[PDB]
Ligand binder design. Structure first.
Ligand SMILES: CC(C)C[C@H](NC(=O)[C@@H](O)[C@H](N)Cc1ccccc1)C(=O)O
Ligand SMILES: [Zn+2]
Ligand SMILES: [Zn+2]
Lengths: 605, 323
């Protein structure tokens, strides 16, 4: 019901002034000022947010909305068929419209991710913005300011005009870049140089406590190496400068969100201080950084929408996210954020997920999972393994691994997926506007690296129900299962003594015995068990992770079922599970006769 | 009954005291042999006087007495080997430290077992005298001398006998010894004074009040155990059904016929098992292990009450009546 945005000039400047001082209530106070055009005027609250691929704009957290034209309140009417659109009537001869409101950010995780704490805050300008309908967002010149808690430091890719006391005024910027230029602020801050030169890269760290900022030299070097390895892959940087934003916290809501010249990232307080325990999540900065090339600069044409209030088409997210998931893990190994053994066991877990952990592939394609952002909005799902769940990430990753192996085979290892990366994202160094692409562009660039029917290859994997893990064998390794723990599973389990048993009993458990996941058609599923039931005892003994694992091993090769005493709501029963395969965890093993292209792929350049 | 109990001791215990208990200083041992008078008859008068004074209703006092009677009819299997007299040694033996089986080791039964004997003494005094004398006459004769005197006036066993004989001639020495040195019934005073101990599924008023608010489950006369609302067993009756399933205090009843434990859940299952041949299935936690036991108990919920014997004179109500 809101008129379509037009690629026409916007006269004047959209001023967005935010007071971010009410940490106790977690309220962002907002004033938006813009020229007022006589007649009906519709203002938009951003709905579809770039990088979320879904209508995540928190419309019901916009409160206290009062709109004044030249100082006189004008009543507003919401469009009942577009609840993000507010309509007012501007009198003839008017000059200026001011909208004031408050963004009531989450006071608990049940409302969304927390954005204010006693020590830090995360300002996402889309949550504090109203903008006129009828214009391509990039045509609206904007200028933002923020009043910070007293004395706090801040970081953002957006250039500062002046700080007066605790009020930071930024230089004017196009409105789409404003939304794409989030800010972290906090009292415990460290700025770390990752790459000097004409297109510099910095790491901005905020923490709950100052002791978490003590990054050691080798740990900083791994982040600096990430930047160096991206240069080798792409040969260009799509920014004039880049600002990593990293929150080390137990209070701010978790985040990984890419932008052209920055990314919003969260880690635990021990990101640096316990480097060897916090490794499984360290592909995060590599992942989001890669999006500066793959997602921000190059974007699918159906995803690159003209404003924030028309729907996004996610059809090509298996490139956007899929190949970024691939490069995040590859680049973690190439830079030293991960060890080679860590990256290899992680890849083994991905391969196992599609060989045995995704029975839903029998009926649903990876391509259809590009609709999961809008279908589910990351709300809880009963069977991620059977409904599927954004597999354009990891399923896409496996496809790109096979693409790499095929490029090598076609060219006697003279070309690889690195050549696609440079060809598709390496043009136009320094540009950070949007360069759209279609499916045919992907095929054409791949064909330019090595001639082959890439259109049929891509569609057969993304529209099919068959194996996605062919890149493992083609690049010289084989997926196996044994009772040796997977490094990723072990690290993810060991803090609370949880039990991941996907490939043995077909479920995962918390240390409490509560079932946290059940594999469709697996042994636990076939006993009627669901997530939320509790394993009370194993063969009569009070549950623990060691107890149930010992029982699985004890049942290997026998005919005596494992007796699980189960609590289902307010009832207790004993189920007999005839599982005798023992503990099974995925790993990769070399195929001795074939060249090891996998290790070449994961090797630093 | 607390203030009635301790007040009665001003007469029975402080003023009149057994000679072996009335020691010359605080640092030579006390002889407790006569505590079934000191505490036993005071336990008796504490409850009687609660009814006479209105601290308790008559219905409350009657259900309390029913619980005492049931305790010695069915709740004290230890009487098969231990006498009430020997429990006067429990203060020094145990110092009220925790014991596994109050019902089998016995536990200061000179209180409530003594109370039951004194009820029977009352009934016998009435029977010997065509209801012209009662235990009230022993109270006045034994403790009613020397108004205003609060020095200690010691007594021996023979003094108890002679004063009882003065109320109504009878071989009181053999009577007292037969009850305090015996292993047989102590509840004869109930029927002699016109009532009968019965059990049914109607809650005992004392048990109900003691159960309430915390949602506990006293099941002594059905499953032979008591439980907290959590399912933790708080008591087990020797040779009862729970005992015969190997259960001990501290074990936990996790489920009843598969349903998560509650006091209502286990009570409903007991009622559902009344008159059938389907055992009650209890899921039990014993330390860190779980097992299911089958209890073949089909008597239903059983709580003690007193009921009139219609043909007999109601002396019990006279005893509990305000004077
Ligand atoms: C902490 C990490 C798990 C974060 C990780 N982030 C990403 O993949 C980003 O590149 C995504 N662009 C973040 C995203 C995608 C879809 C809907 C909402 C948010 C994610 O999976 O959300
Ligand atoms: Zn991503
Ligand atoms: Zn007393």
């Amino acid at each position: 019901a809101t008129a379509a945005p037009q690629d026409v000039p916007f006269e004047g400047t959209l001023k967005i002034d935010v007071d971010a001082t009410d940490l106790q209530h977690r309220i962002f106070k907002v004033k938006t000022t813009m020229p007022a055009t006589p007649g009906p005027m519709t203002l938009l609250y951003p709905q579809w947010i770039p990088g979320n691929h879904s209508p995540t704009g928190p419309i019901d957290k916009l409160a206290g909305l009062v709109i004044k034209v030249d100082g006189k309140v004008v009543p507003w009417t919401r469009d009942q068929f577009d609840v993000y659109a507010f309509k007012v009537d501007v009198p003839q001869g008017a000059s200026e419209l001011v909208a004031e409101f408050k963004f009531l950010s989450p006071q608990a995780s049940s409302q969304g991710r927390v954005m204010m704490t006693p020590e830090m805050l995360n300002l996402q300008w889309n949550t504090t913005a109203l903008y006129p309908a009828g214009y391509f967002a990039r045509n609206i010149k904007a200028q933002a300011s923020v009043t910070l808690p007293a004395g706090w430091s801040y970081a953002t890719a957006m250039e500062t005009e002046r700080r007066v006391g605790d009020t930071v005024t930024f230089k004017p910027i196009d409105f789409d870049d404003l939304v794409d230029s989030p800010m972290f602020a906090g009292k415990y801050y460290k700025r770390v140089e990752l790459s000097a030169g004409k297109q510099p890269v910095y790491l901005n760290v905020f923490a709950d406590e100052a002791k978490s900022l003590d990054a050691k030299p080798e740990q900083i070097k791994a982040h600096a190496a990430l930047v160096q390895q991206m240069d080798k892959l792409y040969g260009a940087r799509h920014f004039d400068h880049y600002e990593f934003l990293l929150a080390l916290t137990k209070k701010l809501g978790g985040i990984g969100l890419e932008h052209h010249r920055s990314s919003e990232n969260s880690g635990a307080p021990n990101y640096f201080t316990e480097w060897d325990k916090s490794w499984t999540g360290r592909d995060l900065l590599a992942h989001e950084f890669n999006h500066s090339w793959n997602g921000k600069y190059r974007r699918g044409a159906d995803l690159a929408t003209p404003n924030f209030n028309v729907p996004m088409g996610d059809s090509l997210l298996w490139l956007y996210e899929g190949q970024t998931q691939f490069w995040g893990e590859v680049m973690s190994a190439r830079s030293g954020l991960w060890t080679q053994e860590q990256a290899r066991d992680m890849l083994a877990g991905v391969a196992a997920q599609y060989e045995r952990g995704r029975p839903g592939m029998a009926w649903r394609t990876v391509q259809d999972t590009t609709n999961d952002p809008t279908m589910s909005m990351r709300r809880p799902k009963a069977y991620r393994n059977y409904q599927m769940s954004e597999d354009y990430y990891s399923g896409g990753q496996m496809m790109w691994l096979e693409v790499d192996s095929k490029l090598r085979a076609l060219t006697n290892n003279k070309r690889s997926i690195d050549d696609f990366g440079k060809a598709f994202f390496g043009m136009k160094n320094g540009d950070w506007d949007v360069n759209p692409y279609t499916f045919d562009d992907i095929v054409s660039t791949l064909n330019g690296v090595a001639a082959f029917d890439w259109a049929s290859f891509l569609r057969s994997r993304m529209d099919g129900h068959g194996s996605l893990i062919g890149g493992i064998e083609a690049n010289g390794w084989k997926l196996v299962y044994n009772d040796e723990p997977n490094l990723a599973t072990k690290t993810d389990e060991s803090d609370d003594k949880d039990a991941s048993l996907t490939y043995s009993l077909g479920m995962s458990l918390k240390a409490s015995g509560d079932i946290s996941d059940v594999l469709w058609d697996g042994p636990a599923f076939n006993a009627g068990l669901i997530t939320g039931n509790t394993i009370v005892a194993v063969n009569g003994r009070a549950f623990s992770s060691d107890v149930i694992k010992d029982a699985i091993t004890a049942a290997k090769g026998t005919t005596v079922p494992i007796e699980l005493l189960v609590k289902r709501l307010d009832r207790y029963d004993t189920v007999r599970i005839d599982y005798h395969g023992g503990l099974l965890y995925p790993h990769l093993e070399r195929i001795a006769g074939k060249p090891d292209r996998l290790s070449e792929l994961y090797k630093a350049r």
